[PDB]
Amino acid sequence: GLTIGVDIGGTKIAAGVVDEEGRILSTFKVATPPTAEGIVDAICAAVAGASEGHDVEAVGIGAAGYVDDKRATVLFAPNIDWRHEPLKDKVEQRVGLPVVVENDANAAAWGEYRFGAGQGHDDVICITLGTGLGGGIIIGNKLRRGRFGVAAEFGHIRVVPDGLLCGCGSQGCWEQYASGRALVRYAKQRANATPENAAVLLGLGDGSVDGIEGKHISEAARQGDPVAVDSFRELARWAGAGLADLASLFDPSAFIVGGGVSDEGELVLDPIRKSFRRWLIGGEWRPHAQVLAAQLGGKAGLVGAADLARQG
Amino acid sequence: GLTIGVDIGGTKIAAGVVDEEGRILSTFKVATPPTAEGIVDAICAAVAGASEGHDVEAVGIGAAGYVDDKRATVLFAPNIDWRHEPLKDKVEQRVGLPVVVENDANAAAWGEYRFGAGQGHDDVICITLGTGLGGGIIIGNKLRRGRFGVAAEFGHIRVVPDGLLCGCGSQGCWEQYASGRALVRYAKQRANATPENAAVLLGLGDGSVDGIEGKHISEAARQGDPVAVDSFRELARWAGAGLADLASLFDPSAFIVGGGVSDEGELVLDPIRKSFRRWLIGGEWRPHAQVLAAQLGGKAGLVGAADLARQG
Amino acid sequence: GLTIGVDIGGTKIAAGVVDEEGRILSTFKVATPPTAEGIVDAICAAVAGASEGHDVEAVGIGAAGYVDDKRATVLFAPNIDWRHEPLKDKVEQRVGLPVVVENDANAAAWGEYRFGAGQGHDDVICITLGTGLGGGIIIGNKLRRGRFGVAAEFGHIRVVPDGLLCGCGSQGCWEQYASGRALVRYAKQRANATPENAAVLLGLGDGSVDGIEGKHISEAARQGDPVAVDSFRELARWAGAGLADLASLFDPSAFIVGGGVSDEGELVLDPIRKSFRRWLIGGEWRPHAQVLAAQLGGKAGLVGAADLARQG
Amino acid sequence: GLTIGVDIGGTKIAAGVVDEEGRILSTFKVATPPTAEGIVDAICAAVAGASEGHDVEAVGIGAAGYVDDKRATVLFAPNIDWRHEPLKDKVEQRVGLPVVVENDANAAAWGEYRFGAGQGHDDVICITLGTGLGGGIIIGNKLRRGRFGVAAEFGHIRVVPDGLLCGCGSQGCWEQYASGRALVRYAKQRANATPENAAVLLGLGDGSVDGIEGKHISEAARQGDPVAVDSFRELARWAGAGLADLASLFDPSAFIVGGGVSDEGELVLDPIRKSFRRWLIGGEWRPHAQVLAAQLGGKAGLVGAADLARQG
Ligand SMILES: OC[C@H]1O[C@@H](O)[C@H](O)[C@@H](O)[C@@H]1O
Ligand SMILES: OC[C@H]1O[C@@H](O)[C@H](O)[C@@H](O)[C@@H]1O
Ligand SMILES: OC[C@H]1O[C@@H](O)[C@H](O)[C@@H](O)[C@@H]1O
Ligand SMILES: OC[C@H]1O[C@@H](O)[C@H](O)[C@@H](O)[C@@H]1O
Ligand SMILES: [K+]
Ligand SMILES: [K+]
Ligand SMILES: [K+]
Ligand SMILES: [K+]
Ligand SMILES: [Zn+2]
Ligand SMILES: [Zn+2]
Ligand SMILES: [Zn+2]
Ligand SMILES: [Zn+2]
Question: Parallel, antiparallel, or unpaired: how do β-strands B2-8 and B12-18 relate?
């Protein structure tokens, strides 16, 4: 039957009724409140708005952060003051339907695997290059959350010893080098070096280096703005090298690369592929994983969380 | 019934008859020949010597390097001139029993999982710190070789961007920092800096920095030789940080740490655990994997390869 | 004749009358105000208090940050909102004596060279390991400020590509790894990993990892607190490696190592020397610079700034 | 009067008679012998051939490696089996003229300073990007060799902790990332990743990745060969970042960038300048050193060594 998926974003919370083929029949969005306590009411309002006129059987919620193996508790969220938050219990009490809580990128990975670019593969690794960096693991046709629920924290593998401080509390995390926030750092540092090579980029914002935002960088790079282009290339080197490490770890059939950074398309995916090939160990002797574009865009987590709510 | 496991080492090739409980009933060793072509005859002689007086049903061979998903072909070996070597076919033709070929550290991981420190866990990651660095993945009670057979090449994940050249052809591999060869580099660099702090260490060899070997370092560290101790501590920082990254990737119940480097025991395992805890992301909020000592020692690959020969 | 030296610190501003032999005859301290504009009045009050009863001929002011080659303008200060601040002019107008403005670590280097550990050498490099990391260059018996006044910004050479964000605006600076702030980071990360090994350290503060301060670390390490000791050793590796790079650049007779971090004495200087020796390139073939303890302590900048006020 | 300069290269030894204006009046080249003992006879034959028809007063010899402060002994050479080699004595005995021995890049720096791009500056840092990476320091109009003769070993400052093994015996040296040998590594790694983007480059050699040589890379990049271009850009990032560190150390009026790598001209110098600007700490507040093209090409060391033979 029909289930609801919920995507908890930094700015908006979206809930959608999703059918068994992963099709979204309704979508209702609410503002993400500044408060943790408010976020629960907002999730419930989003679910109510999406649910109108549909026979809904379960609710799946995708949340950034470490979710336990019981798919019930957010152990830690990077942008919400949730610490061992019993989200499943609180929402079930309020909506009166079964609820599953999943990591956001796990949910997106399952969405891409079941309904997107992963179809036809048995073993795939999905990566989301967004504001944060996440991913999900599919092995033998099943999402793998690990013993304690916290597998596929790809954003927090250390790629630079003694590197940048990260929101997770550690240093040198992949997310500090291959996420949208890294993209903005590269553009700012490059625009500061040579502002004449960033005319288009700076024109799209307020004209200062401080004013550069992620949205500007994609549009400027498309136009051939040298700083914006070079910034994507710098990000692509980190993203491709990290995929190469994941190939040595998991050796999947395919990688599915998604998230806001990947949205510009081949401008960023092509250099990611080139770096993957450069750093793939034993690439002369072993088969190369396919590096595939995600197909569901920003809807992958909503669809995936709804479908994960069925498995149970 | 009984099967034979084969361990192909840099100096010796050992074959052993192994029962269903993982018990080794016979062991026959032959010198590893300098030639690739010779290695096949030697494998066959080792199998014949071990097999005498036992009803053997199958042969499992563990080999360093990338083994395909058909468990038949060595795609690349780091110390043997094998490139797409059809090892299974060549040995089956000669011994007249079914043969499986597995990566050496996959075999050791399966041995530890089935008969050693992994018993009672469903999801474990095994690491071998030896001359090279390898490992194996157990997820949902099954060894995971990946789509193309080449998963768990842990030694070749990049831990240092722009780092040391590695035998795999790449740079900055974990094996360059956490293997026995790294241990020797640290000891040499430290003994060169302060030879007065390496009296015991240098006394165990020929007295020169060039003469320092791995065997010396373990014995000297035990005696409290400062250089030898500090060298293990340096290796332990890399080994523990790498385990922390693997926890973010796989989130297993336990890590099993084995190989020649780990043989000294708590002298090295305790600092590995301390570094693991230091670098475990979200360690305040998530459960900590157990870091367990391997139980089968150098016999794990032989036992594991024999048992893998049953599954089929 | 007599001159006054001024040390502008984060908490206190000290002025002292200094004779031709570098002897401090009077010292007057004032609180560092929270405001940039206030800092000028405070400098003048400190000078007035120190000057009472002495015939003072000139004033030398040591300031953290980039000072121009005219020894007049603070181009940028890391802890004061000074940007192209005409400090010399403002103070001369108010005190009615000639004023020179020098970088703080340049002043300390000249103090150590003329009156401290540098006496008898012609070519010495001084390093200050304090809250920030600074230094000074003496070549052919003269302080070398560079063409634009900004030489010997040792704290901001990049030792880690893609490393930690620094207060200077860049990444991977030596100051992020070898200063007192790095010491505190290492202790916190280590105390978080193994709080049982930091009992003494945590007892000296409020008992939490957050409460660990620099002062605690020195006292705990002295007592053999493992975390505190290991934290100094980690800092010493960065400090010694950086000295080794400076030897390849400047090849001085001696390094003089001072600042608050170095105050514990051989506990930190001995490991710094060991790391220097480890990383000194061509150390087998070339003479080794002496690594000397500073002699003037926290008074070096005051004495040096007073004496620099004479040269002119 | 007239002096002779000698350049000891990996393939050829060149000697030239040089006038007081740095003009080369004669040049005689001899093959560099495979043997250290032979190199002395060859130096003498080169001097004799160049000297014919000129009244020569002194001989200056530039040698790669660490030269002592007496300008007499090669303490260590990276490509010749010289260890504490009394080169001055051996040559003086044979040629019967005063001889000075200087580091090769010191000699080139003095040549550029006196007769090339350094004229009009008082404080300049010269860098040579060739097969090896070297440089020289001019401060207050004088070459600075340091206390023991071994200053300005720029090639062996550590830019990557735990980085590539270097011929000097250490790790992570700037020479491993910004020299001609690094250029070749980048091109090979990139051509391996995407051989279709290296058609022109591979066509210039034997068609294999192994066949790629430095000469090919310059010519291919000029034609817009993507791999060759990207390889120069990768080198330029390391070269520019290193210049930025040197600006924090020495704060010179100008950098003079020379050597074989720089010969292609603005194709490489422009990206070096862009990276310099990106990484220059405090670049918003301090004056920027000029980054200048060398003017004397491969003749700088010969001219500089001849002129250094006058000062004495
Ligand atoms: O939101 C994308 C990712 O952000 C990371 O910082 C979090 O640790 C992940 O749990 C999440 O999947
Ligand atoms: O022998 C231990 C390990 O050595 C590594 O260098 C190889 O790549 C692995 O396949 C092997 O498992
Ligand atoms: O105060 C010590 C040092 O701190 C550094 O951060 C500043 O850049 C230097 O100018 C100063 O000498
Ligand atoms: O030849 C250029 C440079 O090569 C480096 O490897 C040597 O250490 C230097 O002494 C020399 O100046
Ligand atoms: K995940
Ligand atoms: K493996
Ligand atoms: K300074
Ligand atoms: K030099
Ligand atoms: Zn992180
Ligand atoms: Zn490798
Ligand atoms: Zn800095
Ligand atoms: Zn080197």
Answer: antiparallel
Backbone conformation region of residue C44, classed left if phi is above 0, alpha if psi is from -120 to 50, else beta: alpha
Instruction: Quickly count: other Cβ atoms within 10 Å of residue A46's Cβ.
Output: 25
Distance C75 CA to ligand 7 centre (A): 13
Half-sphere exposure of C146 (CA within 13 A, CB side): 28
Cα A23–Cα A24–Cα A25 angle in degrees, nearest 5: 110
Counting from 1 in the atom list of ligand 4, the atom nearest the Cα of D135 is 12
User: In the β-sheet with A290-293, what is the strand arrangement from edge to edge?
Assistant: A142-143, A133-139, A124-129, A254-258, A290-293
Residues listed for chain A: 312
Task: Specify whether the CB–CB gap between D131 and D151 falls below 8 A.
Answer: no
Buried b (16+ CB within 10 A) or exposed e, B200-235: bbbebbeeebeebebebbbebbeeebbbbbbbbbbb
- Contact between C132 and C179 under an 8 Å Cβ cutoff? The reply is yes
> Which residues lie below 8 Å from residue A5, measured CB to CB, with a gap of 6+?
A15, A16, A18, A59, A60, A61, A62, A107, A301, A302, A303, A304, A305, A306, A307, A309
Residue closest to A253 by CA, chosen among A110, A120, A161: A120
Instruction: Compare all CA atoms of chain D with the CA of C75 and give the residue at the minimum distance.
Output: D285
By the 10 Å C-beta count (0-12 exposed, 13-18 middle, 19+ buried), A24 is classed as middle
Q: Give chain C's length.
A: 312
- Axis-axis angle for helices C300-308, C104-115 (nearest 10): 90
d(CA A297, CA A257): 10
Report how far residue B62's alpha carbon sits from residue B51's, in angstroms, rounded to the nearest whole number. 17
A79 and A39 Cβ atoms separated by less than 8 Å: no
Residues 6 or more apart whose CB falls under 8 angstroms from that of A129 comprise A178, A179, A180, A235, A239, A257, A258, A259, A260, A261, A262
DSSP A43-112: HHHHHHHHHTTS-EEEEEEEESSEE-TTS--EEE-SSS--EEE-HHHHHHHHH-S-EEEEEHHHHHHHHH
Q: According to CATH, what is the number of the domain D1-120+294-312?
A: 3.30.420.40
For the record, the structure tokens of D224 come out as 């817009």
Other CB atoms within a 10 A radius of the CB of residue A310 amount to 16
Binding residue per annotation — A168?
A: yes
Q: Is D152 left (phi over 0), alpha (psi -120 to 50) or beta?
A: left
Nearest C-alpha of chain D: how many angstroms from B7? 32
State if residue C149 touches ligand 3 by the CB under 6 angstroms criterion. Answer: no
Nearest CA to ligand 4 atom 8: D65
Give residues (CB < 6 A) around ligand 4.
D 64-65, 78, 103-105, 128, 130, 132, 134, 153, 155-156, 175
B145 token code pair: 């070789």
Of D161, D190, D277, the CB nearest to A194: D277
Given a contact cutoff of 8 angstroms between Cβ atoms, the answer to whether D164 and D176 are in contact is: yes
Packing angle of the helix pair A180-193, D266-279 (nearest 10 deg): 110
d(CA D141, CA D120): 10
Experimental method: X-ray
DSSP D32: P
Is there a contact between C121 and D148 (Cβ–Cβ < 8 Å)?
no
C-beta separation of A110 from A121 below 8 A:
no
How close D257 comes to chain B (CA, Å)? 24
User: What is B121-293's CATH superfamily?
Assistant: ATPase, nucleotide binding domain (3.30.420.40)
**Residues carrying CATH 3.30.420.40, chain B:** 1-120+294-312, 121-293
CA dist., res. B159 & res. B168, Å (int): 14
Could you write out the three-class secondary structure of D253-298?
Answer: CEEEEECHHHHHCHHHHHHHHHHHHHHCCCCCCCCCCEEEECCCHH
The protein residue whose alpha carbon is closest to atom 6 in ligand 1 is A132
Distance, in angstroms, between A259 CA and closest chain C CA? 23
